[PDB]
Amino acid sequence: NEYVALITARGGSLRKNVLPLHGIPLIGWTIKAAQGCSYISKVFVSTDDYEIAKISEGLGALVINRPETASSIDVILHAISWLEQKEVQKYEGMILLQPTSPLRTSHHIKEAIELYEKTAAKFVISVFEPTHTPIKSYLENDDGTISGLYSNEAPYQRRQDLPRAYQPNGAIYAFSIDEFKLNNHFPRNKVFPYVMSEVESADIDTLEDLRKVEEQLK
Amino acid sequence: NEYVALITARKNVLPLHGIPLIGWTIKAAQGCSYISKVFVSTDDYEIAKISEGLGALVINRPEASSIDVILHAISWLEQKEVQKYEGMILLQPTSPLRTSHHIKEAIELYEKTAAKFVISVFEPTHTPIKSYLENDDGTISGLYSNEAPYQRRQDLPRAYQPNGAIYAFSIDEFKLNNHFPRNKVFPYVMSEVESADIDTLEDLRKVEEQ
Ligand SMILES: [Ca+2]
Ligand SMILES: [Ca+2]
């Protein structure tokens, strides 16, 4: 089994992917995390921006030049098409890695591929259990009323007595290139969770997010 | 017509801008024109001394369940109070950012909608409507629908989380069920900022800095 790492990074309009973090641009961490994992064969950055592509090429990553608020699937399908045409080796699985998740390491990627193999999953998605579990939330009805999202008794039943609810952190998406091509979407069946902490689930959007992560890092 | 405020009680006495945490919820209830009397359901002499100091009336409870504290309070009110109260306004002492205005707007909605229950909520930054539920085989699928984690927020129905600041219900309905109404429940929506529930000392520190 051969895996390819795909890192999707666009340009500014906040140019977050190139923001410095402990002396390496944000995207650098995710390229290095991918490159440092023994299961990853090649690392590709789909970018529409010169600075992202030059940084990427500087760290030994291969640039997928992307054309012109585009769909995320249309980016993966383009990447799959580019890989089919420009690469000799057939890749089994794609490891989609968001450049704004610097706290997701090579170990996380390793453990997520190990689970994708062990469970023989169609899809592995990196998740976290929120502090306020969605399993005890309420859903707004058409009349304006509210009732339990899981069941009517759920907001009142304790956490232990209810099934685990997860939120995606967007750090890792491990899937089969062949299945994705068939559907033109992510697998809706045999989807398994790779559970990470709420701490490790940091998604840099603002400079306060970046500052918290600069501090966190020690 | 008539509403009674019930505040169920080391966190509750923690100082916040010169008043113990419970003081804020006591004052918020007392400052609302729709609230007739304010009680603090507590099993500690130090909390009951502070509560009485801030003009709240103490319901002395025996030295854990939330419903057992609501029904005890209802029983105490039946026996020790002459006036019959229609609705109970349950107010958590760990929600100091919930004001008399919030309580007012909450009761105004309980009346306007003619609800059986009104619960103070907030729309989380990560909507529960786009979350995943763990199956028995170990697999995961959308909590609302299988397509939900992939459908955009706008195209999906509003999911709320309770902040626990306000629970407006009928004393007569809760007595017969021995639980909260499961029908005609309406949401009173507050911000994620106003939804602060003091648990840790970092939570208090963040609330002081406001
Ligand atoms: Ca781990
Ligand atoms: Ca308001």
Residue numbers in the entry:
A (entry chain B): 3 to 15, 19 to 73, 79 to 228
B (entry chain A): 3 to 11, 20 to 73, 80 to 226
What does the paper behind this entry write?
The first step of the incorporation pathway involves the activation of sialic acid to a cytidine monophosphate diester form catalyzed by CMP-sialic acid synthetase (EC 2.7.7.43), a ubiquitous enzyme that is found in both prokaryotes and eukaryotes. In the presence of Mg2+, CMP-sialic acid synthetase (CMAS) catalyzes a sequential ordered reaction that involves a nucleophilic attack on the α-phosphate of CTP by the anomeric O atom of β-Neu5Ac and the production of CMP-sialic acid and pyrophosphate (PPi). The activated sialic acid is then incorporated into LOS or LPS by sialyltransferases. In this report, we present crystal structures of the apo form of the VcCMAS enzyme and of that complexed with cytidine diphos­phate (CDP) and Mg2+.
